Ligand binder design. Structure first.
Ligand SMILES: [Ca+2]
Ligand code: NA
Length: 223
């Protein structure tokens, strides 16, 4: 997260860190056994880390649970990032409480101009590299489809939306991938891609979760 703020410990209780010996992506807890992330975050060996603030210090509220199964979207295209969504099933159920909690799936898609909360442990610089230990947050508005398509001509599908600031300076970034975009208490986006981070006229691009709710529900009900 570039240009954001320190969230505060466990104030984003649905945020997870995906670990393969090191933090590599975010995710969102949607019930006690399932996490939603980005398909481009797929790795063979994944441990889900819930209740994290500092990802390099055991502070007392963590749950570390290995994945039993990953399910990349059937239509995921790694070239275009169309359908950049994956479900991860936990080997054992998380214990839900104040610091570890699920985020609701959307019934409606999100509205242009809604300010959403984007969070993660990704790079905090638009040029250079600095990775935080504690969870970072950003308030960012949903941009119109027209503005998004103008920013990334020939690249935005119906399964993507832009959020952030055309002036630059505030955005998600590498290492935030797979994490949440929460708008009005619903998971509306997944950190997916962008040209650099926090660059002028190059806002973040996010997987449009409202298009996948039927797939998510059907998949959870059968696995
Ligand atoms: Ca920790
Ligand atoms: Na809704």
């Amino acid at each position: 997260i570039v240009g954001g703020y320190t969230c505060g410990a466990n104030t984003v209780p649905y945020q997870v860190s995906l670990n393969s010996g090191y933090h590599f992506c975010g995710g969102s807890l949607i019930n006690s056994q399932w996490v939603v992330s980005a398909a481009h975050c797929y790795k063979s060996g994944i441990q889900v880390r819930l209740g994290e603030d500092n990802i390099n210090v055991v502070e007392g509220n963590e749950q570390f649970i290995s994945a039993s199964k990953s399910i990349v979207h059937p239509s995921y295209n790694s070239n275009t990032l169309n359908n950049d969504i994956m479900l991860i099933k936990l080997k054992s159920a998380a214990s839900l409480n104040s610091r570890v909690a699920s985020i609701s799936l959307p019934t409606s898609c999100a509205s242009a101009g809604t300010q959403c909360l984007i969070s993660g442990w990704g790079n905090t610089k638009s040029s250079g590299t600095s990775y935080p230990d504690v969870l970072k947050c950003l308030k960012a508005p949903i941009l119109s489809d027209s503005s998004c398509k103008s920013a990334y001509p020939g690249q935005i599908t119906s399964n993507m939306f832009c959020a952030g600031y055309l002036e630059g300076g505030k955005d998600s970034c590498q290492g935030d991938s797979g994490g949440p975009v929460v708008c009005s208490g619903k998971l509306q986006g997944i950190v997916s891609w962008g040209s650099g981070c926090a660059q002028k006229n190059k806002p973040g691009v996010y997987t449009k979760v409202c298009n996948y709710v039927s797939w998510i529900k059907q998949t959870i009900a059968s696995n």
